């Protein structure tokens, strides 16, 4: 999370029933959040606020410490959170997707998707796109949507493995898609062509990040705890990081314009 | 500068109607867009002017456009070296075990 009034990065990690914030310059603790009755399941940050979800209700944290807004109305656990301007998108386990206005706490729009046909496993809002969110499924299909018009723009047939990760590439119209088979597909959503494909034989791709300091380097996580560095320019593997963590990789990110 | 340099040397599959229609959106009174103005006349610009402003802010933040944006063992992950059937030379792999006469200790040769 980048901050206003302080030209620094902050990284927020969940700790049981609370969360901790550290500055990336020296990994020093700056704030410890208030407790919530149940264990936090999903977390999101949008610069100004930190969003945490527990059970079927999720709340917003201000000043990284104390809650100021709570949002009820879901009958299943929240599995994805996407901040969208002044609005927040929450996706439930049963298949309900609802957009909430943060400050007024009113219910803007609600959508449902059939669990057997289309179960949401990844959510992404591509940059420079007006009111557009891309949704992936365990089945393997992708749907592009417009929140404001509430219509289906396009449906991507995709691949039969199923989507497990979505990431915005350092380009206007390019995304990186992770699959359960260990294959990462870098795709252009506007004209529907696949730029390149990379395959890791370590299980599903947990997370993907891009290096933006002038070197075309890509990293993809694996549940074994290994990290593979792929060369985007020459379509090859640079090197592999073995046992970066003893357990499964939770999330990996390149800092902006940094090595 | 340019003179000195010389001497030395489809269609999108989908369309969104609200992006087509020419409505105008206020950069003023919106915190995220107030930081994005250029001149004072751009208090409220239309859809097409929003699109090019957003894209160039993205590219300047990214530092430009990457070059990649416009049989073999290093397009997969795997090993290269394996163990040989014959005994390797140089280094012997050994682990000490319990003494053979551990149960019956003796002091003679």
């Amino acid at each position: 999370r980048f901050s206003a009034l302080k030209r620094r990065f902050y990284v927020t990690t969940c700790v049981g029933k609370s969360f901790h914030t550290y500055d990336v310059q020296k990994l020093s603790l700056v704030a410890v959040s208030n407790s919530v009755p149940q264990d936090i399941c999903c977390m999101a940050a949008d610069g100004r606020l930190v969003f945490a979800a527990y059970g079927n209700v999720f709340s917003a944290f201000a000043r990284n410490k104390e809650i100021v807004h709570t949002f009820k109305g879901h009958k299943a656990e929240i599995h994805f959170l996407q901040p969208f301007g002044d609005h927040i998108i929450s996706v439930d386990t049963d298949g309900i997707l609802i957009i909430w206005h943060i400050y007024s706490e009113e219910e803007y729009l609600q959508l449902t998707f059939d669990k057997s046909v289309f179960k949401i496993s990844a959510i992404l809002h591509p940059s420079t796109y007006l009111n557009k969110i891309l949704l992936g499924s365990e089945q393997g299909s992708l749907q592009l949507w417009n929140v404001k018009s509430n219509k289906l723009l396009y449906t991507f047939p995709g691949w039969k493995v199923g989507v497990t990760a979505l990431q915005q590439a350092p380009a206007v119209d390019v995304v990186a898609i992770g699959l359960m088979s260990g294959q990462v597909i870098i795709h252009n959503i506007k004209f529907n062509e696949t730029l390149m494909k990379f395959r890791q034989d370590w299980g599903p791709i947990t997370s993907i990040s891009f290096r933006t300091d002038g070197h075309p380097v890509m990293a993809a996580g694996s549940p074994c705890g290994h990290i593979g560095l792929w060369d985007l320019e020459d379509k090859k593997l640079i090197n592999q990081m073995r046992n970066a963590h003893s357990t499964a990789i939770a999330g990996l990110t390149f800092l902006h314009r940094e090595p | 500068e340019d003179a000195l340099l010389r001497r030395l040397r489809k269609k999108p599959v989908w369309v969104d109607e609200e992006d087509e229609d020419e409505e105008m959106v206020d950069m003023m009174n919106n915190r995220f867009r107030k930081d994005m103005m250029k001149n004072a006349s751009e208090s409220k610009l239309s859809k097409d002017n929003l699109k090019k402003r957003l894209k160039e802010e993205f590219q300047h933040a990214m530092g430009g456009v990457p070059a990649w944006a416009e049989d073999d063992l290093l397009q997969r992950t795997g090993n290269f070296i394996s163990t040989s059937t014959s005994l390797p030379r140089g280094i012997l792999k050994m682990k000490n075990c319990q003494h053979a006469n551990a149960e019956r200790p003796t002091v003679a040769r």
Binding site: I99, H101, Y108, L130, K148 | -
Partner: peptide
């Protein structure tokens, strides 16, 4: 984002 605040 450009969604309206309420309704």
């Amino acid at each position: 984002s450009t969604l309206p605040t309420c309704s």
